Amino acid sequence: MKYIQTEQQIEVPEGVTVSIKSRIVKVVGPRGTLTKNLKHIDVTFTKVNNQLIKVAVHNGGRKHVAALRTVKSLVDNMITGVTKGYKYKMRYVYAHFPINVNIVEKDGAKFIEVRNFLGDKKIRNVPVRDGVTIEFSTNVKDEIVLSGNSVEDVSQNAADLQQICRVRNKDIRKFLDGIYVSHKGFITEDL
Amino acid sequence: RSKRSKLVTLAQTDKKGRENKERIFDEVREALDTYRYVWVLHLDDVRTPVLQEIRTSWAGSKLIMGKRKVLQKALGEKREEEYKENLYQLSKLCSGVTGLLFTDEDVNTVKEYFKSYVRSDYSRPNTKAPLTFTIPEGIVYSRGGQIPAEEDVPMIHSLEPTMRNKFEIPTKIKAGKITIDSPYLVCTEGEKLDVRQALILKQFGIAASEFKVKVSAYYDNDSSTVESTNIN
Amino acid sequence: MQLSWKDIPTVAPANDLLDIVLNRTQRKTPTVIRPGFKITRIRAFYMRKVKYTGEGFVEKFEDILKGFPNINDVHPFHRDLMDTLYEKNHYKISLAAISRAKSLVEQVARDYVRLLKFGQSLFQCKQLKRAALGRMATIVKKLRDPLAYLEQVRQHIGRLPSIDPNTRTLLICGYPNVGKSSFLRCITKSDVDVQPYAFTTKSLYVGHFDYKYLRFQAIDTPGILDRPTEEMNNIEMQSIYAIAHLRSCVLYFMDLSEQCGFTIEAQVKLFHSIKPLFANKSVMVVINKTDIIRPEDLDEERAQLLESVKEVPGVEIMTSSCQLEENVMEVRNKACEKLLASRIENKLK
Amino acid sequence: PQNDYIERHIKQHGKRLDHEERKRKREARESHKISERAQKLTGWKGKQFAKKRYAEKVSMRKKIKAHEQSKVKRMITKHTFVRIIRPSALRQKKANVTHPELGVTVFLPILAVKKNPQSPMYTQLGVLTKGTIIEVNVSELVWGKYAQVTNEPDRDGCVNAVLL
Amino acid sequence: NLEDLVKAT
RNA sequence: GCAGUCAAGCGUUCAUAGCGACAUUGCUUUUUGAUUGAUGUCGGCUCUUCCUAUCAUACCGAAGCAGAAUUCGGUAAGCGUUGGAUUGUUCACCCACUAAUAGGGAAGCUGGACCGUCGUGAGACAGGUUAGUUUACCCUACUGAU
RNA sequence: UUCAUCUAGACAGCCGGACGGUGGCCAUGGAAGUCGGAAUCCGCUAAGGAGUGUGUAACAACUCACCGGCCGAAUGAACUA
Ligand SMILES: [Mg+2]
Numbered sequence A: 001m002k003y004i005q006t007e008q009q010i011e012v013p014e015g016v017t018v019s020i021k022s023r024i025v026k027v028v029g030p031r032g033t034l035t036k037n038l039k040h041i042d043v044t045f046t047k048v049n050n051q052l053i054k055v056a057v058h059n060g061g062r063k064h065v066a067a068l069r070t071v072k073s074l075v076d077n078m079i080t081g082v083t084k085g086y087k088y089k090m091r092y093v094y095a096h097f098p099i100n101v102n103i104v105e106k107d108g109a110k111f112i113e114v115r116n117f118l119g120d121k122k123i124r125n126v127p128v129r130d131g132v133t134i135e136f137s138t139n140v141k142d143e144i145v146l147s148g149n150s151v152e153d154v155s156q157n158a159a160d161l162q163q164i165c166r167v168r169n170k171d172i173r174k175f176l177d178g179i180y181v182s183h184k185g186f187i188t189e190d191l
Numbered sequence B: 001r002s003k004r005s006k007l008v009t010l011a012q013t014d015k016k017g018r019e020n021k022e023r024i025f026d027e028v029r030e031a032l033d034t035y036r037y038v039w040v041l042h043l044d045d046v047r048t049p050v051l052q053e054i055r056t057s058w059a060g061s062k063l064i065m066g067k068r069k070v071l072q073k074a075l076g077e078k079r080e081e082e083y084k085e086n087l088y089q090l091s092k093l094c095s096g097v098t099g100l101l102f103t104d105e106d107v108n109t110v111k112e113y114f115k116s117y118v119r120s121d122y123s124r125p126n127t128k129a130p131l132t133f134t135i136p137e138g139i140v141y142s143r144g145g146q147i148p149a150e151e152d153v154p155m156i157h158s159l160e161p162t163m164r165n166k167f168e169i170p171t172k173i174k175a176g177k178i179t180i181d182s183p184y185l186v187c188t189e190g191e192k193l194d195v196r197q198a199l200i201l202k203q204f205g206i207a208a209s210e211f212k213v214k215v216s217a218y219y220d221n222d223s224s225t226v227e228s229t230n231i232n
Numbered sequence C: 001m002q003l004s005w006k007d008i009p010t011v012a013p014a015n016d017l018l019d020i021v022l023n024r025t026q027r028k029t030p031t032v033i034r035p036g037f038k039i040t041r042i043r044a045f046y047m048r049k050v051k052y053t054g055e056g057f058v059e060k061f062e063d064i065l066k067g068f069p070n071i072n073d074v075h076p077f078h079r080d081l082m083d084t085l086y087e088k089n090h091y092k093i094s095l096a097a098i099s100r101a102k103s104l105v106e107q108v109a110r111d112y113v114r115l116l117k118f119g120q121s122l123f124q125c126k127q128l129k130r131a132a133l134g135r136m137a138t139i140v141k142k143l144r145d146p147l148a149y150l151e152q153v154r155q156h157i158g159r160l161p162s163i164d165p166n167t168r169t170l171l172i173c174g175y176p177n178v179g180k181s182s183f184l185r186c187i188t189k190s191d192v193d194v195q196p197y198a199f200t201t202k203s204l205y206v207g208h209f210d211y212k213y214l215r216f217q218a219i220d221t222p223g224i225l226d227r228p229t230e231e232m233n234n235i236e237m238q239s240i241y242a243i244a245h246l247r248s249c250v251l252y253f254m255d256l257s258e259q260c261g262f263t264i265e266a267q268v269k270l271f272h273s274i275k276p277l278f279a280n281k282s283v284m285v286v287i288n289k290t291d292i293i294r295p296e297d298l299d300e301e302r303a304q305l306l307e308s309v310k311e312v313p314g315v316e317i318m319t320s321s322c323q324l325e326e327n328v329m330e331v332r333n334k335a336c337e338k339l340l341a342s343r344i345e346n347k348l349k
Numbered sequence D: 001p002q003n004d005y006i007e008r009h010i011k012q013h014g015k016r017l018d019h020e021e022r023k024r025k026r027e028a029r030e031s032h033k034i035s036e037r038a039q040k041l042t043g044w045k046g047k048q049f050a051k052k053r054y055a056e057k058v059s060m061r062k063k064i065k066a067h068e069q070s071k072v073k074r075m076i077t078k079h080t081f082v083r084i085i086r087p088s089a090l091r092q093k094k095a096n097v098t099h100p101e102l103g104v105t106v107f108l109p110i111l112a113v114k115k116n117p118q119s120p121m122y123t124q125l126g127v128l129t130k131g132t133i134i135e136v137n138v139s140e141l142v143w144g145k146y147a148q149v150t151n152e153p154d155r156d157g158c159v160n161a162v163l164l
Numbered sequence E: 001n002l003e004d005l006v007k008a009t
Numbered sequence F: 001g002c003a004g005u006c007a008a009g010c011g012u013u014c015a016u017a018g019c020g021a022c023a024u025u026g027c028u029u030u031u032u033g034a035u036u037g038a039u040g041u042c043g044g045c046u047c048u049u050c051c052u053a054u055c056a057u058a059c060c061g062a063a064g065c066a067g068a069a070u071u072c073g074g075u076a077a078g079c080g081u082u083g084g085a086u087u088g089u090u091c092a093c094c095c096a097c098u099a100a101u102a103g104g105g106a107a108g109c110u111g112g113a114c115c116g117u118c119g120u121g122a123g124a125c126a127g128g129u130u131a132g133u134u135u136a137c138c139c140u141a142c143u144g145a146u
Numbered sequence G: 001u002u003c004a005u006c007u008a009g010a011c012a013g014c015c016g017g018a019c020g021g022u023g024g025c026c027a028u029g030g031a032a033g034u035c036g037g038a039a040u041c042c043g044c045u046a047a048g049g050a051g052u053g054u055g056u057a058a059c060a061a062c063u064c065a066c067c068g069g070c071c072g073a074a075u076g077a078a079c080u081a
Helices: A062-083 A151-164 B018-034 B048-056 B068-075 B087-093 B107-116 B157-165 B195-204 C014-028 C039-067 C076-085 C088-116 C122-142 C144-159 C180-187 C234-245 C264-277 C300-311 C325-348 D005-013 D019-040 D043-072 D120-125 E002-008
Strands: A005-011 A017-021 A024-029 A032-037 A044-047 A052-058 A086-093 A100-106 A109-115 A124-127 A132-136 A143-148 A178-185 B037-042 B062-066 B098-103 B119-121 B133-135 B172-174 B177-179 B184-187 B209-211 B214-220 C169-173 C205-211 C214-220 C251-255 C284-288 C316-319 D094-099 D104-115 D132-136 D146-149 D160-163
Touching: A005 A062, A024 A062, A032 A062, A052 A062, A062 A151, A086 A151, A109 A151, A124 A151, A132 A151, A143 A151, A151 A178, B018 B062, B018 B068, B018 B098, B037 B107, B048 B062, B062 B068, B068 B087, B068 B098, B087 B214, B107 B214, B157 B172, B157 B177, B157 B195, B157 D019, B184 B195, C014 C039, C014 C122, C014 C144, C039 C088, C039 C122, C076 C088, C076 C144, C076 C234, C088 C122, C088 C144, C169 C180, C169 C234, C169 C325, C180 C205, C180 C214, C180 C325, C205 C325, C214 C325, C234 C264, C234 E002, C251 C264, C264 C300, C264 E002, C284 C325, C300 C316, C316 C325, D019 D043, D094 D132, D094 D146, D104 D120, D132 D160
Parallel strands: C169 C214, C169 C251, C251 C284, C284 C316, D094 D160
Antiparallel strands: A005 A052, A017 A024, A024 A032, A044 A052, A086 A143, A086 A178, A100 A109, A109 A124, A132 A143, B037 B098, B037 B214, B062 B098, B119 B209, B133 B184, B172 B177, C205 C214, D094 D104, D104 D132, D132 D146, D146 D160
């Protein structure tokens, strides 16, 4: 309808500080700092206090107002990642050939190395994105934990791990081997 | 143009609309006209068998349930007009799900009955769990290791995805049976019950929380006054 | 014999088949013709179209007709199995419908090419081409129900096992739950499933083992019910026709706890009824769940049945427990040795 | 493997750990993908897509209406029949005759040609065309004897007639 | 009956 | 295709003044799976380039797709896509060979007509006139060279 | 443009209810709303199909049809260009 103005709210908890200048967003909370370059969007940021930040679009169309809520949700994810983090649990399952998963250091960088997937002689390497730490679950079978401030980084790392162990030229009804995202939560789970 | 397509489902029952609310308004007007005592009760998570048991616990008396705003309008919310005097005082105190009991019987008798009546229903979220539960490490059985395991048959394979996804329980299917790698406790005594914790307790189907019919107040057609009785 | 028909090409329904053939024609043949061309060239274009479509239809139909087994000239055991699983007359008439469609398409193709011989314009040639393709499409659409039926038949018969009647087969029957499943999974590595209710597996199951350097096979039945059997459902008719057509040592199982729910009296009656079915076959009767009770210390009331079936010749009696590997191997050894003795007499013949 | 082995395998082992969510997300994307195919398929594939989509919409509308209603409740190159040379392949011996009385269509043979609106010479030659009056045989068996052929046979490759 | 069947085999 | 059947809709608004999308009898036709090729003025080889409507090779999607093999489909023209027989040259087709032996566009030797006669329920005359013109040492393209 | 619903509460979401004869009737080894064929009934209801689908050998469980609480404000459908 070509609205004159549209606004979205962004709440800021008592521990985090948000700096915005020329559509570069820095969120600094208890757990570190995240930076997002939003110059590909056309919005205006304002604040009335230290607890609330408005994102506004003036005289925008359907696509512009569609991007507005996206901007708000991205900043919300930055706040959540800086205050509570993200933890993705993946499980790997097999029938015959046990999948061997290790953290190796190749050329000075972290890699998730997967060996013996469906009996393959091929070594699979998944580079660990910076900011996400990889752990192996205690007292749990075949569970790998990806923890990070950036939900984008954690989710893309889990997606890469899941896609690297695709089953080729077989029946997925019969062959269930693979690494799967078992659960998605936060690094703090008080209740 | 880019719009969500509404789900199209071919089912018999159709939403009734304004006429059903009109008929409820008329029926409560009739009940208040032709009865003496109208009690306001709260029945929040009450099953239809319990509602029917209370319904059949009297034939002369009448139970009316429905929209809170419609009932508050019928009873009277303002001093410009109301069926009887001082009814806004009773109407304001109604809180959640409405229940109207119309009778001519003894106030003490109905109070004693609603005090004595109690039922053990499903546990509910954000409520104290009367008894704790902990799935053992073995093959997962339907009841949950309470009734004789040798008597009962283990959990069906069809519920394993639901438990693994919504109930946040590590589960695997071995030879067709659901199992777990370590004992897993769901809740402790007097602990706030999560939505999923309530779901899992109901999934094992151990109905243990004590449900009761509570009353907030009542009104009479002879003295026309509001008496605050707090029976839980 | 062929012993298997998994090599039947997948059958497509009427609309999918129509899309496949017509789109193949439109892609694999030239599609540009001009009214300003020679009439002979226009005729060649449209005749090639008609002929190509006819060839595609008949080749798909030829695949269909060559794939499915001729249930008439096939081995009698396989014939009865196919009849019990899917009605034989229905199967034959669906195949015959395929054959009629093939013939009709071929005849229409020849006829419309003959008519196109005298094409007088691009318009008339196009009209004749459309008429030929439309007639073929009508035939294929009328062929709908046989295509779906034969697709289901193709899937199921591809999934059927490979039982050779002219082998050393050990047939296993009785009520469900008696221990046929356990016995088969013990003597062979067959993957059947056991549940506490009737007709748990609705199909025959096969397994293999070796004995004295000879490959024997073992068949496990779905289970049989004791009735007048004038009318019966296919699940147990499979077992009946297997017992009839399989030259085997029938190893009938018995229970003394009546865990399946039937009486030992009913088991004896069923065995007495099936006794005339047993022609030049050596029969054994194994009693399972005997760690609780045995014929040795069983009541005389059932001992009357025991002496009656001992009177029945020339079956032999044994009690066994599935846990005892030595006992199950002795059951297997007795059955294999009596099969060897029968074949040794046959070699003397 | 024998019998329903894949279903037995699903019972014994389950499916892949992400099967449910994979199917759900796929069918949620399905609507965007239908729109993308409608706007991005070109040529014959696009035309077929639009045709099948229209058929689906018609089927769903009829289904909803039915549910609600129940709920409420020289050589002559034209076809002939035997100096002028007439090719044999164009000869037609039988036809499909419809009777307007009971609305039935029966396969009835050709015997003679009576009236030809084009030419009495065509009438002599036996040339079949539209609106031509022909004689049929009801020896196969109220019922007539003459039929007016309704369509040009030289296009449709056959003869369709209406019994008078 | 059954004898006829096995004879027909 | 013929006649229909009702209609999603339409028809100057008009339900059977009238039309009409999409969907439903019968055809070579009898059932149990029996016996029931065209092309003569075109065709060869070589050989360039282009299209994709893809036969093979690459990567994907689905399907009782267990495995193996296959079917249908998506992107895709990078790269290829035989030797011989054949009762007229050809293509259908056969023998084999191969990963496959896909279909098309552009596209130099080569293996007639008319005039005239006795006659006509009926044959012949061999009378007469007329035409058949594209088979490098120059310019330019290309390939090399000053 | 025309229909509609709506602060005696609209659309979207969460959480509840989703009942009794009854596992209706016939064939089936079994079929309890959901492999099959026939009317689809009666009561209590705010409201609850002799059932919209997944799901089990049959059950069960979930689900949607429908009604309620939650917060507050317009929303939906069919056509035309
Ligand atoms: Mg059993």
